[PDB]
Structure formats: structure tokens, C-alpha cells
Amino acid sequence: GTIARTIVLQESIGKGRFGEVWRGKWRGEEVAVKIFSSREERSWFREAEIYQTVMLRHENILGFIAADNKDNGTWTQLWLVSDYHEHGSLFDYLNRYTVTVEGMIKLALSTASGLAHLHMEIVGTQGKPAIAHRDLKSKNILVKKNGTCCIADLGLAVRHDSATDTIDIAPNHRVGTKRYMAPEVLDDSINMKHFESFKRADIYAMGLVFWEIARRCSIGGIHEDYQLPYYDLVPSDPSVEEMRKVVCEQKLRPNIPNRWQSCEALRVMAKIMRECWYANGAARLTALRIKKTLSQLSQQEGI
Ligand SMILES: Nc1ncnc2[nH]ccc(=O)c12
Numbered sequence: 001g002t003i004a005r006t007i008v009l010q011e012s013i014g015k016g017r018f019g020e021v022w023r024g025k026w027r028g029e030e031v032a033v034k035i036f037s038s039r040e041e042r043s044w045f046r047e048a049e050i051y052q053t054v055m056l057r058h059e060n061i062l063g064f065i066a067a068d069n070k071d072n073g074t075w076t077q078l079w080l081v082s083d084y085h086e087h088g089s090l091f092d093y094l095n096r097y098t099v100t101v102e103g104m105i106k107l108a109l110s111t112a113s114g115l116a117h118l119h120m121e122i123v124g125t126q127g128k129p130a131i132a133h134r135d136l137k138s139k140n141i142l143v144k145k146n147g148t149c150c151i152a153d154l155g156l157a158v159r160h161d162s163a164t165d166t167i168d169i170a171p172n173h174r175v176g177t178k179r180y181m182a183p184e185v186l187d188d189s190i191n192m193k194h195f196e197s198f199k200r201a202d203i204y205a206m207g208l209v210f211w212e213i214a215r216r217c218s219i220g221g222i223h224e225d226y227q228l229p230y231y232d233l234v235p236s237d238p239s240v241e242e243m244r245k246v247v248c249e250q251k252l253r254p255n256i257p258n259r260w261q262s263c264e265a266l267r268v269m270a271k272i273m274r275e276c277w278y279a280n281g282a283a284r285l286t287a288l289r290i291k292k293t294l295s296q297l298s299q300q301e302g303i
Pocket residue numbers: 013014021032062082083084085086088089142152153
């Protein structure tokens with residue numbers, strides 16, 4: 001293609017389960033290129049399909065540029081070109097840095113604004129269907145130069161046809177990162193024909209993400225070391241069983257240190273986390289309500 005032939009790959013920045021991410025230069029600008037092999041076409045095509053959803057572009061959704069293919073003379077590579085964010089993942093950003101209260105609210109609100117857009121159905125001729133991430137985690141959220149997030153890795157997404165209340169790919173199996181799986185996903189009680197269930201499962205995962213950010217918030221040089229949710233209860237790369245035992249049976253969640261009650265911003269973040277973590281998906285906050293809360297918190301702080 002015309003786009004892939006003009007892109008120079010400079011650095012392989014990640015090797016995931018579906019495709020490898022490269023830092024490339026396009027028309028003198030930095031771009032991220034997700035490359036898939038010939039045998040990963042279904043993964044590539046689906047992610048292109050999601051990223052090309054009508055009215056998807058949003059400041060807190062990774063900016064998609066193009067799908068393309070590149071023949072190097074021996075084999076074809078399937079490309080997905082998108083915006084490049086030098087900070088990379090929220091995961092890397094939180095491992096590397098601590099944030100201020102202003103910084104924390106910025107990352108949390110942008111994530112919630114991006115998820116609220118994804119979840120929001122826009123009716124019209126240029127209508128946008130409601131979309132559920134299904135694999136929301138700190139490794140799938142990128143951090144922009146201005147200190148705000150954007151949701152990335154939309155390849156596992158599902159889209160809602162609101163008129164019939166049917167999901168475009170009618171999921172029949174559990175997907176996503178085990179650590180971040182909602183209680184109803186771990187114990188397989190989730191109604192996979194119920195789109196609102198998927199949005200609720202995303203909210204649970206966002207609550208875990210907020211916890212990771214809040215730990216790295218530095219007030220009076222006090223903060224926790226970076227940790228994945230449940231680091232204190234499950235091993236690295238946990239199994240569904242290891243997760244179900246903790247999240248569903250023992251019904252534990254990431255610990256909220258009492259000192260988060262000391263700060264107004266961490267109090268708001270802690271109440272949100274708790275209202276994301278309810279074992280019953282229906283009691284959980286909606287992403288739009290979280291966006292409303294944090295927007296109301298940000299304006300006061302003066303961001
Ligand atoms: N688009 C991006 N920009 C910068 N870093 C990234 N790392 C991993 C996956 C991405 O998509 C990405």
C-alpha cells in the first residue's frame with residue numbers, strides 16, 4: 001500500500017499475543033505500527049474493523065491512521081498504523097513515575113472519558129455503536145505528552161446493535177487479561193448475550209486501573225510502589241482459577257490504604273474504585289457517571 005511503502009520502521013517496541021508494535025516514521029512524523037503475520041489476518045482485520053467504527057475518534061481513544069499490507073519480497077506483513085505516544089503504556093508510565101494529585105485526576109478522567117465515549121451509543125446516519133473493550137488494563141492504555149490517557153488495544157472489542165440488542169461478534173468464550181476479569185467473567189455467570197454486562201465488566205477493570213494510578217499519587221512525598229492489582233494475592237500471569245478463588249470466593253479486592261481518606265482527591269478516587277468493584281455488575285458506576293464525578297473534581301483542583 002501507498003501508506004506502508006512510505007513508512008520506515010525504526011524500533012520494535014512490543015511483542016504481544018496478537019502482533020508486534022513498532023515505532024515508525026511517516027511523512028517525517030512518529031507513528032506506531034502494529035504488525036501481524038499472514039496467519040494473524042483475522043486478528044488484524046477485526047482490529048482494523050473496530051478502529052474504523054464510525055465516529056470513534058476521540059481525544060482519549062488511540063488515533064487510528066490506516067490498515068495496510070507490506071510485501072518485503074519474501075512475506076506479507078499486515079499493518080495497523082496509529083498515533084505514537086512516547087510515554088507508551090500507563091503501565092510503563094506508572095512504573096517509571098509518581099504522579100501529582102493533578103496528574104492522577106488527569107490520567108483517571110481521560111481514561112473515564114475515553115471509556116465513556118467507547119460505551120456511548122450515538123444515534124444517526126453517522127451513528128456510533130456502543131463498544132465494550134473486554135481487555136481494559138494499564139498495559140492497554142497509553143499516556144499522551146499532555147499527561148492524559150487514551151485507550152488502545154481495541155482488537156478484542158465487541159459492538160452493540162441497539163435495535164435488536166445483539167453483539168456483532170456474538171461472543172461465546174472468555175477473553176482478556178485474567179487479572180482484570182470481572183467477577184462475573186471469572187465465574188462464567190456473565191450473560192454473553194447482554195451487552196450492558198460487557199460495559200459493566202469494563203468498569204470493574206477501570207476501577208482496577210484507577211487503583212494502580214492512585215498508588216502512584218505523591219502527596220507530601222508519600223506514595224506506594226507500583227503494583228498490579230492483586231499482586232498481594234495471585235502470582236504473575238495468574239490463572240482464571242487463581243483469580244476466581246480470590247475475587248469471587250474470598251471476595252477480596254485491591255486494598256484501599258486508609259490514608260487515601262486523608263486527601264479529597266484520593267477519597268473521590270477510592271469511592272469510585274469501590275463503586276467499580278461491586279460483585280454485582282448492575283450496582284457499578286457507569287463510565288459517564290465517573291467522567292462526571294472526576295470532571296467536577298478536576299475543575300475545583302484547577303487542572
Ligand atoms: N500506539 C502506541 N504508541 C506508543 N506506544 C505503544 N505501545 C504499545 C502499543 C501501542 O499501540 C503504542
